[PDB]
Paper text:
Aldo-keto reductases (AKRs) are a superfamily of oxidoreductases capable of reducing carbonyl to primary and secondary alcohols, found in all phyla. In this work, we identify the enzyme AKRtyl, which is responsible for tylosin reduction. Phylogenetic analysis indicates that AKRtyl is the founding member of subfamily D within family 12 in the AKR superfamily. Specifically, by combining steady-state and transient kinetics, X-ray crystallography and molecular dynamics simulation, we demonstrate that AKRtyl exhibits a positive synergy mediated by an unusual Monod-Wyman-Changeux (MWC) paradigm of allosteric regulation at low concentrations of the cofactor NADPH, but an inhibitory effect at high concentrations is observed.
We obtained AKRtyl ternary complex with NADP+ and tylosin at 1.93 Å by cocrystallizing AKRtyl in the presence of cofactor and substrate at a molar ratio of 1:1.2:10 (AKRtyl: NADP+: tylosin). The structure of this complex is similar to the AKRtyl-NADPH binary complex. In the ternary complex, we found an incredible phenomenon that one AKRtyl monomer binds two molecules of tylosin - one at the substrate binding site where the reaction happens and the other at a remote site which is 15 Å away from the active site. The first tylosin (orthosteric tylosin, abbreviated as tylosino) at the active site is refined with an occupancy of 79% and the position is different compared with that of the second NADPH in the AKRtyl-NADPH binary complex, thus excluding the possibility of NADP+ binding. Tylosino is close to NADP+ with its C20 aldehyde carbon, the one to be reduced, 3.8 Å from the para-carbon of the cofactor’s nicotinamide ring. The distance between the aldehyde oxygen and the phenolic hydroxyl of Tyr53 is 3.0 Å. Outside the active site, the second tylosin binds above the two extra helices α7 and α10 which lay outside the TIM barrel. It has slightly higher occupancy of 93% with well-defined electron density except for the glycosyl β-d-mycinose. In addition, out of the eight subunits in one octamer, six subunits bind tylosin while the other two is blocked by adjacent asymmetric units due to crystal packing. The distance between the C20 aldehyde on the tylosin and the para-carbon of the nicotinamide ring of NADP+ is 25 Å thus its reduction is impossible. The remote tylosina binding site revealed that there were relatively few polar interactions, with hydrogen bonding between Glu193 and Arg195 and the C4 hydroxyl of α-l-mycarose, as well as Glu253 and Arg257 and the C20 aldehyde on tylosina.
Numbering used by the authors:
A (entry chain H), B (entry chain D), C (entry chain C): 1 to 331
D (entry chain A): 1 to 232, 234 to 331
The structure:
Amino acid sequence: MEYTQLGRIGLKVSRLVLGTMNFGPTTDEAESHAIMDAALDAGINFFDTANVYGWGENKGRTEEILGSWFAQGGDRRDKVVLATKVYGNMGLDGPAWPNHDKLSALNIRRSVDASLKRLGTDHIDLYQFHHVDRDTPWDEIWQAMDVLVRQGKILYVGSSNFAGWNIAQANETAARHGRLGLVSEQCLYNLCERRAEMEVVPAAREYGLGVIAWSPLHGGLLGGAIRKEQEGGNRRAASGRAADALKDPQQREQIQRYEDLLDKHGLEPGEVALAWLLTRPGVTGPIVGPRTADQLASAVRAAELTLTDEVLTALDEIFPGPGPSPEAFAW
Amino acid sequence: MEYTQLGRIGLKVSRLVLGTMNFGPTTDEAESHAIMDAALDAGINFFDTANVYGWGENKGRTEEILGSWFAQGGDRRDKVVLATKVYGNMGLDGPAWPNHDKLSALNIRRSVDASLKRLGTDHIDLYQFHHVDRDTPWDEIWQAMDVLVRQGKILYVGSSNFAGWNIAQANETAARHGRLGLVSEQCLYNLCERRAEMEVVPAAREYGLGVIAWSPLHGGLLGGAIRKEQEGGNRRAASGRAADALKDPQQREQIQRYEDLLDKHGLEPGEVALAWLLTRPGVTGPIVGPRTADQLASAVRAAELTLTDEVLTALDEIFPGPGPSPEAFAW
Amino acid sequence: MEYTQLGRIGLKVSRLVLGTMNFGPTTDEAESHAIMDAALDAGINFFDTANVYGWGENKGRTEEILGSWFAQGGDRRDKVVLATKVYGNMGLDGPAWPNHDKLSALNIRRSVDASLKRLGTDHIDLYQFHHVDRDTPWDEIWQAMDVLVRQGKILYVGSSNFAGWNIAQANETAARHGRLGLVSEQCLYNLCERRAEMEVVPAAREYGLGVIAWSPLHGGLLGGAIRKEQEGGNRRAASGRAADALKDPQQREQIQRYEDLLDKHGLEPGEVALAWLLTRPGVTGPIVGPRTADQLASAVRAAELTLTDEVLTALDEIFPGPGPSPEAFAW
Amino acid sequence: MEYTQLGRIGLKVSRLVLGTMNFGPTTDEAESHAIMDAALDAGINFFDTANVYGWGENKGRTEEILGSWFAQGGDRRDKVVLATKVYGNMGLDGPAWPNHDKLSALNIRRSVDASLKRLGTDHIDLYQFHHVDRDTPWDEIWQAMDVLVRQGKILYVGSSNFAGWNIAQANETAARHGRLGLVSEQCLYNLCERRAEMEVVPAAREYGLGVIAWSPLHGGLLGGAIRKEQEGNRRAASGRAADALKDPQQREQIQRYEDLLDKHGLEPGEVALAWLLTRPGVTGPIVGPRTADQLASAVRAAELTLTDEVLTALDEIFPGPGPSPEAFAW
Ligand SMILES: CC[C@H]1OC(=O)C[C@@H](O)[C@H](C)[C@@H](O[C@@H]2O[C@H](C)[C@@H](O[C@H]3C[C@@](C)(O)[C@@H](O)[C@H](C)O3)[C@H](N(C)C)[C@H]2O)[C@@H](CC=O)C[C@@H](C)C(=O)/C=C/C(C)=C/[C@@H]1CO[C@@H]1O[C@H](C)[C@@H](O)[C@@H](OC)[C@H]1OC
Ligand SMILES: CC[C@H]1OC(=O)C[C@@H](O)[C@H](C)[C@@H](O[C@@H]2O[C@H](C)[C@@H](O[C@H]3C[C@@](C)(O)[C@@H](O)[C@H](C)O3)[C@H](N(C)C)[C@H]2O)[C@@H](CC=O)C[C@@H](C)C(=O)/C=C/C(C)=C/[C@@H]1CO[C@@H]1O[C@H](C)[C@@H](O)[C@@H](OC)[C@H]1OC
Ligand SMILES: NC(=O)c1ccc[n+]([C@@H]2O[C@H](COP(=O)([O-])OP(=O)(O)OC[C@H]3O[C@@H](n4cnc5c(N)ncnc54)[C@H](OP(=O)(O)O)[C@@H]3O)[C@@H](O)[C@H]2O)c1
Ligand SMILES: NC(=O)c1ccc[n+]([C@@H]2O[C@H](COP(=O)([O-])OP(=O)(O)OC[C@H]3O[C@@H](n4cnc5c(N)ncnc54)[C@H](OP(=O)(O)O)[C@@H]3O)[C@@H](O)[C@H]2O)c1
Ligand SMILES: NC(=O)c1ccc[n+]([C@@H]2O[C@H](COP(=O)([O-])OP(=O)(O)OC[C@H]3O[C@@H](n4cnc5c(N)ncnc54)[C@H](OP(=O)(O)O)[C@@H]3O)[C@@H](O)[C@H]2O)c1
Ligand SMILES: NC(=O)c1ccc[n+]([C@@H]2O[C@H](COP(=O)([O-])OP(=O)(O)OC[C@H]3O[C@@H](n4cnc5c(N)ncnc54)[C@H](OP(=O)(O)O)[C@@H]3O)[C@@H](O)[C@H]2O)c1
């Protein structure tokens, strides 16, 4: 396993981050536990979850599945950098009761206690904002997080789905009073969606944040979705983001070009999408989303792949990116 | 229910704040619980109380009534933004034993623990200074509040009965050392008393405080007190501020003009006075003071009223305001 | 002559400030020079002017009259604490060209250079904002003033026609970065208009500003305006604020009672109004507005008057004040 | 003329900003001076220029044309908020000598003195970075600007072609030590190019910067370029506009735009300027008249009220992304 620092901070992480969103709605508890055992065996020490994972009436289930895994002992909790999230509504889906979503100090306080209880742990290593909340100012947010840091309930704070200028405002505000700022941004970034290149990733690099890419396969779309389009099972690529893209002729053609390119080179589409993210400047690593232990083993192989310049150039032809602003749209 | 941010902060509140001062001395425990259940039913998530409410030998009773309400369960504590106050003497009415009133770190320590015990909760969401204390410096006050913040016993700090320059000094002092300042000012503001427009509300707006208006009907004076002047009940308008106003020929003539105006437009005096405050720039909302469940329902109707330009202009004729200083008295 | 520190700073000033607004439009250049010589002979070391004084097409004339006075030599400039103002339109009366009024760094730059030229001096001792400018932020204002301080073009900065919270915001902003804040506020304050007591003077005193009362006789109204109502000459009391007040029945009765009281006590109304301001806590002194040398001589006598407690009580009853906020309108 | 505060600061500016890039290479000195007199007559008090304007061997000519304008007197300098730029190479076109371009304190020092001399003035009201310079840190940049502020050579500092996170970093750095930060961002923004909506404008709004839009007609492309395509010089015949008209999809977009405004009897240049005036946070467009009639046309656009029907139609023809992260994530 290849390791790196998470941005500027002292925390060392596997360049594969284990996502857990599938654990519950798509992968059951026993296979979820097997995937986490295999992840630990492979040297993956960095797990990403969220309070809302589990979905609908089962929001919180994923954290509970991690909690029963940790409860088995065997140094699992000691070994893992445990990340979860606050922002989402944990009540009945639909409009949230006021301050039962978003980033008020009020919702931060109740959300962290519920996550700690489901996870069966006394601390979260990386507590992440799930989304920017434009209505909560950073002196309120940093007050709430600093309460948790000094109580020992969290160690690090990260962001997810921020704009670049939110990262800068957040960390400048933290730095004025000596607080450790955001240590990582968790952003949508993959071959299909590269617009985090314009400002989010440049800002994260300037401020020394880790960058961990969520939906690195675009929801399974990049994992061989066309070749697999007729298979059964509870495949993630059969619904949601990937299925929507495959109904668009232009997006489907792109994915078809991708799968045909890789057939000519003896490469696997999911493994290449992961390996591609590992070449991007500033990217700590993809947050892999295995549905099966087999798909985790494939991810470990992806982290060992060396993409040739020829393949990288061809991928840029199919999936061009904008580069940084202002050059992306001005000069 | 209409919602808004409390000034600049991330807390979302109903634009009706439920005042509880009547609960105890005027409304009994059973009916207070009914009013609070109905407030939650109508979407009101923001309750104001004080340690002194109850009055006399029953100071603390209002908080205890809220404590018994919370103790039923039913997500009541989780759903409510709970505001209470410190400054008042909680001992025998009359001159307080030194440091058993006002805002020393000593009285803050003892008042908050006594409030938490009566409320049956481990934290207060909005802890308010009941009045400015000119003898306690802001580095002493912010030390005391920051102790409670970091212990998790409070979340936010607010002011009540401040001058505008007190708000500015408090929040500039807080900002110097990373602290969230005052998030709201609770001030006397209604059709009868508009002098908060001079400097209190302008300073609150500059510093991004919510503004929540206490005695929004001037103690019942604006709720139809002339028409109801001969009625029984233990009506708040039969005593105190309202009764005193009706003794004065000029103030009584003003209320008469008001009630006669509203008869011509088919409007209710109590609802119009609440709806008028909701139109004022910077006002988060009125802190309604229902004596009955029907009066809470009437307040909810008031929050849906749309006052016409013609009625707003007429109210300004009856109840002119000074505008901001310096223009209010100089140029 | 009685001297005092100007609030908290090391500058010592006479408790009569010589106002120059009459110099030009009401008092001609030679009599203006005689009044300034008489003021210096009496120990008055503190002169207030403004760029706009002169009025109309003659804006700047008063500063020029002071300039020709200083140009006479004889240690006049070295002896005088020279105060002038920025904010007013110096162009054609009417709507100003953008940034040719108010407190942008652009207007501050052009205004001070024009004042310095008219006054015939290389520095202004006290450069005052004529009025709050709600559209210019304090980091812009203090940048512009600090440029002038470091160049040696001004020494001290003062306010005029501020609200109390503006004083607080201004001086907290200056103190953040080691700058000397406002040293004095120049507000309307006299027997007739006491609402600076609510917040402006309390804020000034908290922050250690001098308080220099402008229009101390309410534009001549308190100088015997009723007794002299039939007189000729270009008396200031025949126009503007004083004339408007004498056409008001209640203000006229107030002034009549005042003049009758002072007839009974054998006291001069102009002198008493000045002596009254000298008793008010926090007041550095009145800015006298003599039209003649004899009126200056009269002001000097006023500074040596001791009003009996009987007269002081009678004045407070004829001319009541509001006291400080929040007590002035709440409790 | 409608006026507004420049973002959060005390400076008041007309919502039309007079751009001067045409003065010299496209509009001659006499006509440039007439456009500036007409701008002042209509109440425009805010002029944008740059040291490089004039182009090639004539870089600096535009500042000189403004300088001879000011030299005529009549309160012209006192009335105008004068904005210019530092970053561009002022030597021979091609790779610049080291530190004769970009934002080092060394190049800032030499560039401002040369602009002051050409402009014939002792101060610049708004001195703008022409482009983000990723190699110069903000404590160096603010040192250099503060030197100029304390000497009276500039009043305000603004940015141009920044990313949103650059605006935040600059102004947080400035605020740490009591300095007034950036007061304005000058970005490309018009119907054709709306990606400043992702982060640049949202960051400017949060930090209280003015937002002034350069090439508001996309270089004349939005001024009726297809109707005038065979006319006889015209900025639309070259550069950004010409390239867009060579592309089938952009040409079709502009053809749809010009058809839409034919139906409503409106002028394309005026509508494109009026459209920017409706965008939240936009101080106004930096108009680029080549002629005095084009300036009077801009003044008419500032009085125009676009109906909601037309605004909806423009938005469908010229969709924008809105803010990040929602623009690409959720
Ligand atoms: C010393 C005891 C005296 O008490 C006073 O003289 C107090 C009066 O001057 C009050 C305060 C005035 O009431 C004020 O009328 C001003 C014009 C307002 O000022 C305005 C304009 C402004 C610019 O000032 C602004 O700042 C302010 C906010 O609003 C002000 N406002 C707050 C509303 C308002 O209180 C008057 C109206 C004016 O004359 C109010 C009405 C009801 C009135 O006739 C009362 C008469 C009384 C009780 C007189 C006795 C008689 O006792 C007398 O005692 C004297 C010492 C002797 O001369 C006695 O001789 C026997 C005897 O005279 C008859
Ligand atoms: C008002 C309703 C109209 O809807 C539109 O006009 C939307 C179109 O303008 C879209 C957005 C364009 O698609 C855009 O093509 C630009 C050149 C790209 O811009 C480029 C360059 C850039 C510089 O802009 C850069 O910033 C950007 C990121 O990428 C842009 N990109 C975001 C990809 C891309 O969305 C066009 C391609 C060019 O025209 C996409 C293709 C599929 C198309 O023909 C669609 C036609 C439709 C549906 C037309 C109706 C006709 O309805 C018509 O309604 C009008 C109101 C009337 O004129 C009617 O005529 C009478 C009627 O015509 C029948
Ligand atoms: N911060 C946020 O907003 C956010 C949002 C989404 C996700 N996340 C995080 O990012 C993690 C990953 O997101 P995601 O589940 O959408 O990831 P993804 O990798 O884009 O989608 C997962 C799907 O890709 C396929 N796949 C996974 N590994 C593969 C491999 N080695 N080879 C071929 N196909 C493979 C599987 O598709 P099939 O099931 O069709 O076989 C799998 O179900 C989540 O667990 C969560 O922790 C964060
Ligand atoms: N910070 C402070 O110093 C301070 C001071 C006072 C109050 N407060 C807070 O502000 C809250 C409200 O104060 P308040 O009780 O004096 O409010 P208020 O609304 O001015 O007076 C309450 C009275 O108004 C009448 N009323 C209430 N709702 C009505 C409606 N919808 N229609 C017609 N009449 C209506 C009732 O009068 P009748 O009983 O005659 O029917 C009621 O007893 C208090 O509960 C407390 O939370 C704070
Ligand atoms: N910062 C501001 O906004 C502002 C506004 C106004 C003034 N000021 C400053 O404050 C200064 C004073 O203002 P002001 O001229 O309006 O003062 P004022 O004393 O209220 O009015 C002056 C008039 O009072 C009469 N008077 C003056 N001294 C007298 C005395 N000893 N005995 C009897 N009557 C006397 C004269 O009236 P008659 O002519 O009728 O005899 C004189 O013209 C100005 O010179 C200016 O420096 C500042
Ligand atoms: N910060 C930067 O990087 C940057 C870059 C470029 C420009 N700028 C600034 O932005 C200003 C404007 O840029 P620009 O010249 O490219 O603006 P523009 O409006 O996009 O293009 C100017 C052209 O549009 C046409 N036009 C102008 N006004 C018109 C009207 N009222 N009706 C119809 N057509 C009209 C004319 O084209 P025809 O000649 O074909 O008639 C004119 O030459 C410049 O002067 C400069 O100050 C800044």
